[PDB]
Design a binder for these strands. Structure first.
Ligand SMILES: Nc1ccn([C@H]2C[C@H](O)[C@@H](COP(=O)(O)OP(=O)(O)OP(=O)(O)O)O2)c(=O)n1
Ligand SMILES: Nc1ccn([C@H]2C[C@H](O)[C@@H](COP(=O)(O)OP(=O)(O)OP(=O)(O)O)O2)c(=O)n1
Ligand SMILES: [Mn+2]
Ligand SMILES: [Mn+2]
Ligand SMILES: [Mn+2]
Ligand SMILES: [Mn+2]
Lengths: 494, 494
DNA sequence: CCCAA
DNA sequence: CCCAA
């Protein structure tokens, strides 16, 4: 069944921010499997406990973008997420009209690993064929995106996009009103915005934006969208302006607006990908496959010169993930001679850009971690700069690399981790069990603060301490006991 | 008394978005005088009526910025604004700690016209002296502003900035909790964001940001702020980075974050103003005053060439209000020979940029508006462009110019105004009284929609129709009757 | 003096 | 094939 696949995707595969297909933003130690639909069905049925504050807060995660910009990802509290996932699954025969959208390329799908929503899984060549077919006969292309799409979704516009704005306002129950209420309860009983990273909020965004896709399709516009990004192919510049006007109208019906910084009109024929994609791919040492494994093992000079050229291209243009794409080009084709030099280049670059920190794990097996103690200082310096820059992706990834490889962590960097106080870093330190007393003092300060939302911001840490029998449940409800009794661990071992 | 000056400023001078000192965004026909303290004290006392929806919506206004970007200004519903203004004033001895801030340049003050808050009233030479004193001995400057400051203020952070975050969370009444509640009721019972344009929300932003200013001052940072823009002067680059880190920390305590697009570090000595300010002022025809009125009357060639050079500089740089500054340089020094040519240039430019539409009224008296009917087509074409571009400042300003000068308005652009459906343009058309039936159909559709927030979005139109005895009060409360009985007109004549 | 924020 | 969005 496909409805069951929705349930398993919502709980076990796309509860955490696992939407990136190439490499996960969150380290693989955190996971959402062994969170079975029966367990969420039990949590939703539970009525025990009482909360003074309406709604729930979410575990916060700050991931660096390509330009070192913070992006806010959220891990929803399992009570609110369990109710939301149950309500989404129980009415998928009313919701699955977002599956049959030809203008939304990123949408729920029945993937092999189990996830419904994977960002850029269709790859650039199937994208190339479609882009070539759409671009034919048109001499203008429009790139326009919503300004704050996930962060300013009006939750009360969830019923509207289901049944029309006017009919829903006149009717002021229906399933989409309850979906509105559950999406509000997921984030502090707040109508504006949705959490970023779970697939329930991406489902909500698909539901809202599918009405705009429908009323743009009915006017005969040939357009595609990737979440919030609309690309349009117009024979005339006038039809391009008319598309921008109609998109503004239909988004303003749902309290949404265009990002006019990124909204631009270009003259076809333009590049199908970005420019630096083609510049890196013509200069790539691995752009030709020789079908024998010895011939495509790159020497040290080729990888070093390609990485230097990629650094120059990223500095000169700065309009995309030049370094991410470049190191993902040449990291699997190395031989054992240049493994250490490339690892040193990656260490320097991953200090200078935290986004390149997850790549180290693919070369961390071949590099001898002990060596002359130098790599311990490498990882501790990276941890210190991750604490200062208040980034969560690189900091948690570096904790994962230090713990998984038995690399010691200094006390001063533990103290500035404490000062940073991001939830998943503290969950990793909790999993280390060395710093149990300092984690105990931190969660004790959270407890004596007496704020429900501050406990909800670290529910993952509190539940992980409960699962190893090191802390009582801060909540008076039985959701944590239901999760523990049925075997839910968000740091599972093999 | 200064408290009484606060109350008159809140109701009669800064209820509407009147913070711009050079020229108002809103046309002079809309005004907030004859809304005295006694009427607001009566409306706050009124308990009659019932509303199904908590909170109030606000009259929406979309003003184009220098780069044609829409900025959302809001006119708060007079019940919510009257309660909010009464609560702000009744505790000004607790609130006026924002007056004694030396880092907030734009703040409440006792001005001559009566407004508490005027943006850029100090002028650039008093700013020049202070900027020169601050910039001395420092070789780096930091420009960092909050990303969505007014739109993403958390209302529940209003108690925190009064009494500390931890003390307010432990206490979870105090006056700031009620100020929280009233600021929420001003905008749809929503904790996120404040309306833009009234001085109550600017007072709220001062209250929130003054704690950040205090904890930035205590570390010895020499910095200034203009609403949300922080400028800092550092002897070293590391002091600049440390200021950025501490500012990020103290804003993140209040769920606030920097705009890292506009956050940039420059090397002193940089210019006190922008670059194009200096290029326009060295090339200005009026940069020297000859103290006799005949000698500084500019000929046609000087003004035309200065405006063309300004158009070129605005096209080439595009980093500020080049055209706004340039036309405000040379518009008062014209003689009667070049008045019509400058009006034609302003008409073309004001069609191409709506922000230059308010200037036309200073040259609309000398030019014969009848002429050979051409100016009527000018204004109607500008109106159609304003309705296409969904801007409210230029559209309402052009309505003001057409109505005030007895200029006829075509029916097709009236229908396109109704299709746009901005509130203040419809208030002006209501004031014209020619289009009473179409306005009646529009507000009748709003009434049969049966939504409280859609009536609150056009409360000004509904009250203006109620004041001329052309429509009943949509609300069951007596606030409109209190305002009508005591003589409140938001379109008053002299 | 004449903008913006 | 190997990014982002
Ligand atoms: N790991 C994930 C999971 C989900 N999303 C979602 C949230 C974003 O809203 C959407 C794509 O939108 P943008 O990245 O363009 O971001 P915004 O719309 O929030 O802002 P802006 O237009 O200012 O960049 O993808 C994401 O970015 N990253
Ligand atoms: N006529 C008025 C009255 C008030 N404000 C307020 C609201 C704005 O939040 C604040 C200054 O902030 P910015 O103009 O820099 O705008 P934002 O902070 O909203 O956004 P961004 O940093 O993206 O420009 O001034 C304004 O801009 N214009
Ligand atoms: Mn966007
Ligand atoms: Mn996008
Ligand atoms: Mn800002
Ligand atoms: Mn600003």
């Amino acid at each position: 069944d496909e409805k069951r696949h929705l349930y398993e995707a919502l709980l076990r595969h796309n509860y955490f921010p696992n939407q990136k297909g190439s490499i996960s933003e969150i380290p693989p130690c955190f996971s959402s499997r062994t969170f079975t639909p029966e367990i969420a069905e039990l949590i939703s049925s539970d009525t025990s406990g009482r909360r003074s504050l309406q709604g729930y807060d979410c575990v916060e995660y700050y991931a660096t973008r390509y330009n070192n910009f913070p992006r806010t990802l959220s891990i929803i509290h399992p009570k609110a997420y369990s109710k939301l996932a149950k309500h989404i699954h129980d009415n998928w025969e009313e919701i699955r009209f977002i599956k049959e959208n030809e203008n939304s390329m990123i949408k729920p799908d029945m993937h092999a690993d189990g996830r419904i929503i994977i960002m850029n899984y269709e790859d650039a060549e199937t994208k190339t064929i479609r882009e070539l077919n759409d671009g034919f006969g048109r001499r203008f292309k429009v790139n326009a995106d919503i300004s704050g799409c996930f962060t300013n979704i009006y939750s009360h516009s969830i019923p509207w996009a289901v049944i029309g704005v006017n009919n829903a306002k006149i009717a002021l129950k229906h399933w989409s009103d309850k979906l509105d209420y559950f999406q509000r309860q997921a984030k502090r009983n707040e109508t504006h915005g949705v959490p970023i990273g779970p697939a329930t909020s991406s489902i909500v965004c698909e539901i809202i934006l599918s009405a705009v896709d429908k009323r743009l399709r009915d006017d005969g516009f040939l357009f595609r969208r990737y979440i919030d990004d609309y690309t349009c192919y117009c024979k005339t510049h006038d039809d391009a302006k008319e598309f921008l006007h109609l998109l503004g109208m239909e988004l303003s019906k749902y309290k949404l607006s265009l990002n006019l910084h990124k909204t631009k009109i270009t003259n076809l024929p333009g590049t199908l990908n970005d420019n630096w994609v083609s510049l890196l791919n013509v200069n790539s040492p691995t752009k030709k496959r020789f079908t024998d494994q010895d011939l495509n093992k790159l020497s040290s000079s080729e990888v070093i010169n390609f990485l230097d050229y990629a650094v120059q291209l990223n500095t000169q243009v700065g309009g995309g993930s030049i370094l991410k794409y470049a190191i993902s080009l040449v990291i699997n084709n190395l031989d054992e001679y240049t493994i250490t030099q490339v690892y040193d280049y990656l260490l320097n670059l991953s200090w200078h850009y935290p986004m390149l920190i997850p790549y180290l794990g693919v070369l961390i097996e071949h590099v001898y971690l002990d060596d002359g103690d130098e790599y311990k200082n490498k990882f501790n310096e990276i941890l210190s700069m991750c604490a200062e820059n208040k980034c969560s992706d690189g900091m948690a990834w570096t904790l994962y690399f230090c713990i998984k490889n038995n690399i010691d962590i200094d006390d001063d960097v533990i103290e500035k981790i404490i000062c940073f106080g991001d939830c998943l870093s503290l969950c990793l330190l909790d999993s280390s069990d060395i710093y149990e007393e300092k984690i105990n003092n931190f969660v004790s300060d959270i407890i004596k603060l007496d704020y429900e939302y501050d406990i909800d911001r670290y529910w993952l840490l509190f539940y992980q301490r409960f699962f190893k029998d090191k802390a009582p449940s801060p909540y008076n409800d039985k959701c944590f006991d239901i999760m523990k009794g049925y075997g839910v661990d968000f740091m599972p071992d093999e």
